């Protein structure tokens, strides 16, 4: 009636939407060892920066506020991001039309202003009660993932059981982060698998964090708890630009202008004996600021390393063969892990820094029949299509096709330096060929350097290439092998 | 999915219209497909359809469930014309998997027809199958001057 | 041995950069001329020179660098690309390896949008390489033309 009544009424609806509903959802998600949708948003975002949208949205035809999702925008370490968070306690987190509307709106906003989207998933997918309509909205969301791909960074946190579209949309985003014990990913759950196929599998066997972090490749990182996952996402965003036009952040740095002990150690990192290995991370850490890097896909395809670090305060992407696993050869899994990484970085103007120690490809019927030709060539395509600055350091083995793919000069690297332990040849074993000097004679490598000068040369190459521009093919898109 | 995905992206690159004949139970679940990455690799087909801008006509002959319906040239993923035969079944799930979430089953034949989807305008036409060719031919003729904008980017980041 | 391989790199570095500079100064000072490297050091800010293709050699005496010193550095804090003919080594003559080295730094300068200074001191075309020497002159010319009005060229 009165103005004061209407304002007190608004306070009452807000206590029911944010306090009562939250306590009810905390009680029911306590049954599963999980935080609530709102708790997760408050852990992710800068305190006090959250601006919630569509707080009082309801389904048409119990009609709780929000229809099972919390949307809005905020900031993470001072930069704006958009967020949605599923409420599993409402109808299993399934998306109805009101639900989907809130998510569609928040994605449209993020596309409109060009900021990242963090999706926090905890959902059975599409709401069966609404038939075609729920499928329609999840398709709208997926279309917005596709049109966002390479335009704004997209990050998915999987923080519960997830099926159907609730795993389909994360697969279209750039990074999928799972949490130990509480999260899963499958097309459909185990009881539907039993009734339909019918296999008797446990949820962890079917789509647990370890399955997706180590086997399928669908998870880029698994956190020990929810806060570990959320903290990983925050660190990740600290490396990336808001969009594909505006620049990545630049932090100040304590890099040394001369040669340090850590630089000199690289002169002794390669063993004398060819059948002895080394840890490529011992090389990576000596180059990157503070020896630190956030590793993508750490438990998947450990024979290659993909990480973000910084050189002189600038975001840098590192792809490096890891000799401590499978001799650092390329297989299908390493190829696709590094391929998608490079394409993401090229889409967002992060230069790629490659450390090459590649004896060749993993042989075998398993590799060849599972499509090593069309799946491993994705890494070739990724490198050749990219236009970001590309610097390559060749530490040791560099044979045949492996040499070609790992950012050689001919595939489009802007700067290729070799250590004296680098062996660039068609195949191995006569070791007058066991060195980089035939390649250096042809100019295929630009520099043969003492290993201890690596950090100095990389830092100066990156700086020399900050204004690089390269023309692209005139086309709707390419036809990369799938 | 990988077969049809690269097929579609190729046809879109060379401006060949895509005509989809749809009767799909959904994506194949089970440990074999999950551990091989069905989640991100089957979605390549979604990326292919949504990415494309060529004219797209879809004929739904029979089954149209879940992700299968979404991916196989649905209206929301960007199809310009969606026509369904009367034998079309458009639902989130089949009645055998949706109802163990309550024989209150053949009342789930609410969904055993195309008329709910037609009611929401998610399909444009419900036609006798014998008129398909007729309706495809004119739809293709009507769409030859289609133009659609594309995102401003070096390239997307399709799942690999 | 790793330490051996690094020691060997140090040795070749000194035959390519140090000893050749001594021989080249001895023969060009006779003619009242500086060397390719000394001119680069006069041009560029101290300590900013990054040399490329130091160990390039022709294919068929096969001296390192094939008669041209190429790289990039700074002039008054701003980036430039540079090449400098070594007239003592093989007459500073235009070969395929030579021309490759100059094409590389011209491509680099066009890539990053910085000026190019080229220091010329050359007996012409390596005749033994036949039409190839022409082919590489033409290649450089074409890059001059596509750079024209795009990057400064001195
Ligand atoms: C990016 C591309 C987008 C493409 C879009 C698409 O194609 S979408 C694909 C279309 N299909 C899907 O998304 C469906 C996938 N989902 C499923 O198969 C199933 O829902 C499931 C595997 C999660 C099974 O979950 P369970 O119900 O067994 O688990 P649980 O018992 O803990 O769930 C508790 C509560 O949540 C309800 N519930 C769970 N999932 C539900 C759903 N999808 N729709 C409606 N209600 C659901 C249950 O009824 C139950 O309600 P009560 O507690 O009240 O009894």
Author numbering:
A (entry chain A): 15 to 75, 81 to 448, 480 to 532
B (entry chain D): 354 to 455, 475 to 532
C (entry chain C): 16 to 75, 81 to 174
Sentences from the paper on this structure:
X-ray crystal structures of SamR0483 alone and in complex with hexanoyl-CoA reveal the molecular basis for medium chain acyl-CoA recognition by this unusual YCC β-subunit, prompting us to rename it medium chain acyl-CoA carboxylase beta subunit (MccB). Similar to other bacterial YCC β-subunits, MccB has 3–2 symmetry and is composed of three individual dimers that form a ring-like hexamer. Each monomer can be divided into two domains harbouring two copies of the crotonase fold that pack together in an antiparallel manner to form a dimer. Taken together, these results establish the existence of a unique YCC-dependent pathway for unusual polyketide extender unit biosynthesis.
To address this question structures of MccB bound to either one or four molecules of hexanoyl-CoA were solved to 2.75 and 2.85 Å, respectively. These co-crystal structures were obtained via incubation of MccB with 5 or 10 mM hexanoyl-CoA before crystallization. Interestingly, the electron density corresponding to residues 452–477 of monomer F was only present in the crystal form bound to four molecules of hexanoyl-CoA, suggesting that the helix-loop-helix lid region of MccB is stabilized at higher substrate concentrations. The first region is located at the entrance of the substrate binding pocket, which is characterized by a network of hydrogen bonds between the adenosine moiety of hexanoyl-CoA and the protein. The adenosine moiety is further stabilized by a hydrogen bond from the backbone carbonyl group of Pro453 to the 2' hydroxyl group of ribose. The structures of MccB with hexanoyl-CoA bound were compared with the previously-reported structure of PccB bound to propionyl-CoA 21. In the PccB co-crystal structure, propionyl-CoA binds close to the entrance of the active site, leaving the 3' phosphate of CoA more exposed to the solvent. In contrast, MccB sequesters its substrate deep into the active site via hydrophobic interactions between the side chains of the residues lining the substrate binding pocket and the aliphatic portion of hexanoyl-CoA. Further, the adenine ring of hexanoyl-CoA is tilted ∼90° with respect to that of the adenine-ring of propionyl-CoA in the PccB co-crystal structure. Superimposition of the substrate bound MccB and PccB structures strongly suggested that replacing Gly161 with Phe in MccB would cause a steric clash with the aliphatic chain of hexanoyl-CoA.
